Amino acid sequence: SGAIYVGNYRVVNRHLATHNDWANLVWEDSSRDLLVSSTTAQGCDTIARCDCQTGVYYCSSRRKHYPVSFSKPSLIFVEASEYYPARYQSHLMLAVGHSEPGDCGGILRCQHGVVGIVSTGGNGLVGFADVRDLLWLDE
Ligand SMILES: NC(=O)[C@H]1CCC(=O)N(Cc2noc3ccccc23)C1
Numbered sequence: 144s145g146a147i148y149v150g151n152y153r154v155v156n157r158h159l160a161t162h163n164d165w166a167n168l169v170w171e172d173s174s175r176d177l178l179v180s181s182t183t184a185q186g187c188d189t190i191a192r193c194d195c196q197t198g199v200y201y202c203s204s205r206r207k208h209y210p211v212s213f214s215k216p217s218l219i220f221v222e223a224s225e226y227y228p229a230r231y232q233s234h235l236m237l238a239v240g241h242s243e244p245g246d247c248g249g250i251l252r253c254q255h256g257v258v259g260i261v262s263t264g265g266n267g268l269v270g271f272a273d274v275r276d277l278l279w280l281d282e
């Protein structure tokens with residue numbers, strides 16, 4: 144679990160969005176596993192606008208932050224789960240690191256701000272859904 148709060152927006156994994164997120168929907172993309180909903184309160188986070196390929200993410204299944212080197216956002220095959228059929232997930236960044244399904248929503252940050260959130264993983268890998276291209280989050 145986990146979300147990004149920026150301005151009047153809440154960014155979550157689409158597969159973990161609540162009834163309230165869908166009732167206040169701004170934008171969603173099943174191919175990216177992202178959903179953005181509107182909030183009444185001003186958010187605590189700021190978004191990176193950079194090409195960083197190193198950062199630190201929070202891993203709730205270890206209660207720890209880990210440093211990662213990650214690939215540029217790209218189209219990657221993701222095996223079927225209870226939430227989605229087997230498909231290519233877009234704007235996904237891979238890295239070597241521990242992650243379990245409940246870790247989705249953990250934030251990845253670089254020196255510039257929030258880069259993305261945990262969305263995929265397994266077998267010593269962790270995948271992050273990028274949010275740096277979503278320029279409208281800042282306005
Ligand atoms: N973006 C997706 O399609 C995810 C939907 C929820 C989900 O369980 N997965 C598969 C999964 N197995 O092991 C993981 C470790 C970390 C994060 C996800 C996973 C993929």
Ligand SMILES: [Zn+2]
Binds near residue numbers: 254255
């Ligand atoms: Zn950066």
